Amino acid sequence: GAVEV
Amino acid sequence: GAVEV
Amino acid sequence: GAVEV
Amino acid sequence: GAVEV
Amino acid sequence: GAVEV
Amino acid sequence: GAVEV
Amino acid sequence: GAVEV
Amino acid sequence: GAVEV
Amino acid sequence: GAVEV
Amino acid sequence: GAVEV
Amino acid sequence: GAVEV
Amino acid sequence: GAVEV
Amino acid sequence: GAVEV
Amino acid sequence: GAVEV
Amino acid sequence: GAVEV
Amino acid sequence: GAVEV
Amino acid sequence: GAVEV
Amino acid sequence: GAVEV
Amino acid sequence: GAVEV
Amino acid sequence: GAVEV
Amino acid sequence: GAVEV
Amino acid sequence: GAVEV
Amino acid sequence: GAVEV
Amino acid sequence: GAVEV
Amino acid sequence: GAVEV
Amino acid sequence: GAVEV
Amino acid sequence: GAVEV
Amino acid sequence: GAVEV
Amino acid sequence: GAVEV
Amino acid sequence: GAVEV
Amino acid sequence: GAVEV
Amino acid sequence: GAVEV
Amino acid sequence: GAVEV
Amino acid sequence: GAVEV
Amino acid sequence: GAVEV
Amino acid sequence: GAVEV
Amino acid sequence: GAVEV
Amino acid sequence: GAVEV
Amino acid sequence: GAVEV
Amino acid sequence: GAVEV
Amino acid sequence: GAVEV
Amino acid sequence: GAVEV
Amino acid sequence: GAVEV
Amino acid sequence: GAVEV
Amino acid sequence: GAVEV
Numbered sequence: 143g144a145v146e147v
Numbered sequence: 148g149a150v151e152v
Numbered sequence: 153g154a155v156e157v
Numbered sequence: 158g159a160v161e162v
Numbered sequence: 163g164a165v166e167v
Numbered sequence: 168g169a170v171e172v
Numbered sequence: 173g174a175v176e177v
Numbered sequence: 178g179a180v181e182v
Numbered sequence: 183g184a185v186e187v
Numbered sequence: 188g189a190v191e192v
Numbered sequence: 193g194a195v196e197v
Numbered sequence: 198g199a200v201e202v
Numbered sequence: 203g204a205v206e207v
Numbered sequence: 208g209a210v211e212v
Numbered sequence: 213g214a215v216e217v
Numbered sequence: 218g219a220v221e222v
Numbered sequence: 223g224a225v226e227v
Numbered sequence: 228g229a230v231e232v
Numbered sequence: 233g234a235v236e237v
Numbered sequence: 238g239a240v241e242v
Numbered sequence: 243g244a245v246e247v
Numbered sequence: 248g249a250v251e252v
Numbered sequence: 253g254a255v256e257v
Numbered sequence: 258g259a260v261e262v
Numbered sequence: 263g264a265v266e267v
Numbered sequence: 268g269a270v271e272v
Numbered sequence: 273g274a275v276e277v
Numbered sequence: 278g279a280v281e282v
Numbered sequence: 283g284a285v286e287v
Numbered sequence: 288g289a290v291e292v
Numbered sequence: 293g294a295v296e297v
Numbered sequence: 298g299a300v301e302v
Numbered sequence: 303g304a305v306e307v
Numbered sequence: 308g309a310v311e312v
Numbered sequence: 313g314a315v316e317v
Numbered sequence: 318g319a320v321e322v
Numbered sequence: 323g324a325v326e327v
Numbered sequence: 328g329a330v331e332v
Numbered sequence: 333g334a335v336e337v
Numbered sequence: 338g339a340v341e342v
Numbered sequence: 343g344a345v346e347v
Numbered sequence: 348g349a350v351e352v
Numbered sequence: 353g354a355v356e357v
Numbered sequence: 358g359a360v361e362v
Numbered sequence: 363g364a365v366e367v
């Protein structure tokens with residue numbers, strides 16, 4: 143996945 | 148998935 | 153999926 | 158799906 | 163689906 | 168689908 | 173899917 | 178999927 | 183998937 | 188996957 | 193995977 | 198979805 | 203959906 | 208839907 | 213989804 | 218258990 | 223269990 | 228357990 | 233497991 | 238496990 | 243394990 | 248345990 | 253383990 | 258997803 | 263344990 | 268282990 | 273995902 | 278233990 | 283081990 | 288993922 | 293232990 | 298071991 | 303991942 | 308121990 | 313995965 | 318070992 | 323994998 | 328990963 | 333011990 | 338994975 | 343061993 | 348793997 | 353993996 | 358692997 | 363792995 147912050 | 152914050 | 157916040 | 162908040 | 167809040 | 172609470 | 177809480 | 182809380 | 187909190 | 192907190 | 197905090 | 202056993 | 207066993 | 212066993 | 217055993 | 222929604 | 227909605 | 232939503 | 237007051 | 242007041 | 247006030 | 252959401 | 257006030 | 262045992 | 267979200 | 272105020 | 277035992 | 282998110 | 287105020 | 292025992 | 297996120 | 302204020 | 307025993 | 312993130 | 317910050 | 322203010 | 327904090 | 332015993 | 337991240 | 342900061 | 347202010 | 352902090 | 357900073 | 362701090 | 367700074 144890809145967590146973006 | 149992709150969590151966006 | 154995609155959770156948006 | 159897509160949860161929006 | 164799509165939950166909106 | 169869609170479900171709240 | 174989509175689920176809140 | 179998508180799940181919040 | 184995607185999950186917050 | 189993707190998970191925050 | 194991906195995990196924050 | 199939302200399972201509460 | 204929403205299962206409450 | 209909403210199952211309450 | 214969201215399992216609360 | 219004892220589920221109170 | 224004992225489900226109170 | 229004892230789930231209070 | 234069972235609910236009370 | 239069971240819920241109280 | 244069980245919930246109280 | 249004792250889950251309070 | 254169980255939750256209190 | 259989000260398991261709360 | 264005693265999970266408070 | 269159990270949560271308090 | 274997010275397991276809270 | 279005693280998890281407070 | 284258990285959480286306090 | 289994110290295990291909180 | 294006593295995990296406060 | 299346990300957390301305080 | 304991220305284990306917090 | 309006593310983990311505060 | 314890929315965490316971005 | 319336990320955390321304080 | 324990928325994990326922050 | 329990141330173990331915090 | 334007493335881990336503060 | 339790949340953590341970016 | 344335990345952490346203080 | 349990959350881990351920061 | 354590869355941590356970049 | 359890869360770990361910073 | 364490879365940490366880059």
Ligand SMILES: *C(=O)c1ccc(-c2ccc(-c3ccc(C(*)=O)cc3)s2)cc1
Binds near residue numbers: 144148193
């Ligand atoms: C060999 O067995 C093998 C198996 C899996 C892989 C993967 C490379 C990237 C993967 C991945 C990317 C992004 C996400 C989230 O969006 C999840 C997994 S798996 C390589 C070699």
Ligand SMILES: *C(=O)c1ccc(-c2ccc(-c3ccc(C(*)=O)cc3)s2)cc1
Binds near residue numbers: 143144148149153
């Ligand atoms: C080899 O067996 C293999 C299997 C799976 C993969 C994946 C690469 C990216 C994946 C992914 C991306 C994004 C999301 C969320 O949106 C979930 C999974 S799986 C690579 C190699």
Ligand SMILES: *C(=O)c1ccc(-c2ccc(-c3ccc(C(*)=O)cc3)s2)cc1
Binds near residue numbers: 148153154158178
């Ligand atoms: C190889 O076996 C394989 C299987 C699945 C995948 C996926 C790439 C992205 C996926 C995904 C994206 C977004 C969402 C939510 O909207 C859910 C799943 S699965 C790659 C390779």
Ligand SMILES: *C(=O)c1ccc(-c2ccc(-c3ccc(C(*)=O)cc3)s2)cc1
Binds near residue numbers: 153154158159178
């Ligand atoms: C390979 O087997 C495979 C299977 C499924 C997928 C998916 C990519 C995105 C998906 C998805 C997106 C959005 C939602 C909610 O709206 C649910 C699922 S599944 C990729 C590869």
Ligand SMILES: *C(=O)c1ccc(-c2ccc(-c3ccc(C(*)=O)cc3)s2)cc1
Binds near residue numbers: 159163168173
């Ligand atoms: C491959 O097998 C595969 C199967 C399903 C999918 C999906 C992509 C998005 C989906 C979806 C979107 C929105 C909702 C709610 O409105 C429910 C499902 S399923 C991709 C690939």
Ligand SMILES: *C(=O)c1ccc(-c2ccc(-c3ccc(C(*)=O)cc3)s2)cc1
Binds near residue numbers: 143188189
């Ligand atoms: C060994 O042969 C083998 C079997 C399974 C896998 C996986 C590839 C991608 C995986 C994955 C990544 C991210 C997520 C996020 O939820 C879920 C699954 S497992 C590799 C090698």
Ligand SMILES: *C(=O)c1ccc(-c2ccc(-c3ccc(C(*)=O)cc3)s2)cc1
Binds near residue numbers: 173178198199203214
């Ligand atoms: C094996 O290949 C396999 C079997 C099942 C799955 C699932 C991914 C998400 C699932 C799910 C989503 C939502 C709910 C109600 O929340 C229940 C199950 S099953 C992946 C791979």
Ligand SMILES: *C(=O)c1ccc(-c2ccc(-c3ccc(C(*)=O)cc3)s2)cc1
Binds near residue numbers: 173198199203204208
């Ligand atoms: C195997 O390939 C497989 C079997 C089932 C699934 C499911 C994903 C989500 C499911 C679901 C959603 C919502 C509800 C009522 O909430 C019940 C089940 S089943 C994925 C893959």
Ligand SMILES: *C(=O)c1ccc(-c2ccc(-c3ccc(C(*)=O)cc3)s2)cc1
Binds near residue numbers: 168203204208209
């Ligand atoms: C296998 O491919 C498979 C079988 C069933 C499913 C389901 C996804 C959501 C389902 C569902 C939604 C809502 C309700 C009443 O809430 C009951 C079931 S079944 C996915 C994949």
Ligand SMILES: *C(=O)c1ccc(-c2ccc(-c3ccc(C(*)=O)cc3)s2)cc1
Binds near residue numbers: 213259
């Ligand atoms: C084996 O190859 C295999 C079997 C299952 C899986 C799953 C990845 C995510 C799953 C899932 C997502 C969401 C929910 C309700 O949250 C339940 C299960 S199962 C990967 C690989």
Ligand SMILES: *C(=O)c1ccc(-c2ccc(-c3ccc(C(*)=O)cc3)s2)cc1
Binds near residue numbers: 202219224234
């Ligand atoms: C069909 O196999 C089937 C479905 C459910 C069950 C259950 C065994 C124990 C259950 C339960 C225990 C405790 C509580 C809360 O106090 C709620 C449900 S359901 C057996 C067989």
Ligand SMILES: *C(=O)c1ccc(-c2ccc(-c3ccc(C(*)=O)cc3)s2)cc1
Binds near residue numbers: 207212218223224233
């Ligand atoms: C058809 O197989 C079938 C469907 C449900 C069941 C159940 C076994 C135990 C159940 C249950 C236990 C405890 C509580 C709450 O106190 C609620 C349901 S249902 C068996 C067979």
Ligand SMILES: *C(=O)c1ccc(-c2ccc(-c3ccc(C(*)=O)cc3)s2)cc1
Binds near residue numbers: 217218233
């Ligand atoms: C079908 O095999 C089946 C499904 C569930 C169960 C359960 C065994 C113990 C359960 C339970 C224990 C404690 C609490 C909270 O106090 C809630 C559920 S469910 C057995 C068999």
Ligand SMILES: *C(=O)c1ccc(-c2ccc(-c3ccc(C(*)=O)cc3)s2)cc1
Binds near residue numbers: 228243244253263
């Ligand atoms: C089906 O095998 C099955 C599913 C769950 C269980 C459980 C054993 C202990 C459980 C439990 C203990 C404590 C708490 C919180 O106080 C919640 C659940 S569930 C047995 C068999």
Ligand SMILES: *C(=O)c1ccc(-c2ccc(-c3ccc(C(*)=O)cc3)s2)cc1
Binds near residue numbers: 183188213258273274
């Ligand atoms: C073996 O090859 C194998 C089996 C399972 C897996 C999984 C990677 C991520 C999984 C998962 C993601 C999300 C959720 C609900 O959060 C549950 C499970 S299973 C990888 C490799």
Ligand SMILES: *C(=O)c1ccc(-c2ccc(-c3ccc(C(*)=O)cc3)s2)cc1
Binds near residue numbers: 249253
């Ligand atoms: C099915 O084997 C199964 C699933 C869970 C369990 C559990 C044993 C102890 C559990 C537990 C202990 C303490 C707390 C918090 O106070 C929460 C859960 S679950 C046994 C068997």
